[PDB]
CSV table of C-alpha atoms and ligand atoms in Angstrom, one decimal:
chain,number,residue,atom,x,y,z
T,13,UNK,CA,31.0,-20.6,23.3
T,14,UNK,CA,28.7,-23.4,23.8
T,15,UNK,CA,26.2,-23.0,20.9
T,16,UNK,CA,22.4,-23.6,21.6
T,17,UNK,CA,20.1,-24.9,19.3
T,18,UNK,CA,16.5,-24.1,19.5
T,19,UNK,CA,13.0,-23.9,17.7
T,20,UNK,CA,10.3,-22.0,17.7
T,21,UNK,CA,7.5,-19.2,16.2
T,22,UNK,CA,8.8,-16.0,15.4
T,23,UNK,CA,6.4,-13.5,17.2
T,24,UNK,CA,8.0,-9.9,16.3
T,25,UNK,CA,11.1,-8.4,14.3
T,26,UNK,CA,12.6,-5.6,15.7
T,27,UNK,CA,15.7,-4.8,13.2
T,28,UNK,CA,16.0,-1.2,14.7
T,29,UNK,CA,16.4,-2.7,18.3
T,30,UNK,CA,18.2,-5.7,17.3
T,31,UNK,CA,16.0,-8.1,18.2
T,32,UNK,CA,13.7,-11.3,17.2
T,33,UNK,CA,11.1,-12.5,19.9
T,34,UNK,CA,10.7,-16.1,19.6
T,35,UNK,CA,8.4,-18.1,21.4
T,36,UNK,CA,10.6,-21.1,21.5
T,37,UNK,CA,9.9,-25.1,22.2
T,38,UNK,CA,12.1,-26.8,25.0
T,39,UNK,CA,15.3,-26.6,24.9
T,40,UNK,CA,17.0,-29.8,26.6
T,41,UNK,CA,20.9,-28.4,26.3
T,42,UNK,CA,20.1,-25.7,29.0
T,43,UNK,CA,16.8,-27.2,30.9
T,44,UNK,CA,14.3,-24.5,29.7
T,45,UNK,CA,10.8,-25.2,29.0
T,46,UNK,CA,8.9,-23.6,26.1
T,47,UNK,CA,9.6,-19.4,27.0
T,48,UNK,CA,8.9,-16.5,24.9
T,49,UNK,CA,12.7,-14.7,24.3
T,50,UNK,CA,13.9,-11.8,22.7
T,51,UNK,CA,17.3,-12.7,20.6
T,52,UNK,CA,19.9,-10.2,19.6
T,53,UNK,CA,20.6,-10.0,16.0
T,54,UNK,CA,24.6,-8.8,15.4
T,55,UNK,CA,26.3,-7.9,12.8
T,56,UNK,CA,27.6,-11.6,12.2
T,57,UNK,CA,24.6,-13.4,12.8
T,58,UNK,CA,23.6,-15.5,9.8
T,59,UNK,CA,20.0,-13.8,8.7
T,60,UNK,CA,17.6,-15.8,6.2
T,61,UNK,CA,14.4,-14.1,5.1
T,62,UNK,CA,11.8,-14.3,8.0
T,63,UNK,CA,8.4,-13.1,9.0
T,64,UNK,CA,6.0,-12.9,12.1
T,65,UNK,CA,4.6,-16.7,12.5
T,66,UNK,CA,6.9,-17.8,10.7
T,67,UNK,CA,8.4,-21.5,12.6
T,68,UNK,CA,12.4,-21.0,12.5
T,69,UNK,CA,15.3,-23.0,13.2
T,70,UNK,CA,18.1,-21.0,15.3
T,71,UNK,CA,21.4,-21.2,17.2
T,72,UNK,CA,22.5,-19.0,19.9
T,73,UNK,CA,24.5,-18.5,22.6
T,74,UNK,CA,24.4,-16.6,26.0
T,75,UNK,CA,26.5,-13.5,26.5
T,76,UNK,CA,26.1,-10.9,29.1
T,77,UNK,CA,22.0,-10.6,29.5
T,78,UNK,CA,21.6,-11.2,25.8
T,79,UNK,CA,21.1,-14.2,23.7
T,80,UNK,CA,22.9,-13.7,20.8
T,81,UNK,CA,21.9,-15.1,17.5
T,82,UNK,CA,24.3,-17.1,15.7
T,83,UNK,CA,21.9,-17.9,12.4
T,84,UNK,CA,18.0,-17.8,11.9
T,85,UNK,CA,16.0,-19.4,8.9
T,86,UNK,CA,12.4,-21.2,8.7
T,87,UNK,CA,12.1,-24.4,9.3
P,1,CU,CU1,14.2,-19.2,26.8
């Protein structure tokens, strides 16, 4: 439930597999340093036009051994 906000550079789109791999900048909320993730697109997530390199703005949270995305758009 607890929704995390992160940035970082997009670094591949994977619609077919469900997934964005983000090479994201620290995230405080949760104590991770800079990581390159792969985040679950679902049916509700909140999709904005993106590309490869492109810097984003998201929100997540953690469910299972996914990180689910809650919306994506550049920043
Ligand atoms: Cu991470």
């Amino acid at each position: 439930p607890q929704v995390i906000s992160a940035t970082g550079v997009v670094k591949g789109i994977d619609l077919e597999s469900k997934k964005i791999t983000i090479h994201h900048d620290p995230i405080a909320a949760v104590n991770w340093p800079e990581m390159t993730m792969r985040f679950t697109i679902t049916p509700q997530t909140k999709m904005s036009e993106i590309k490869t390199g492109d810097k984003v703005a998201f929100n997540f949270v953690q469910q299972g051994n996914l990180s689910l995305l809650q919306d994506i758009k550049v920043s």
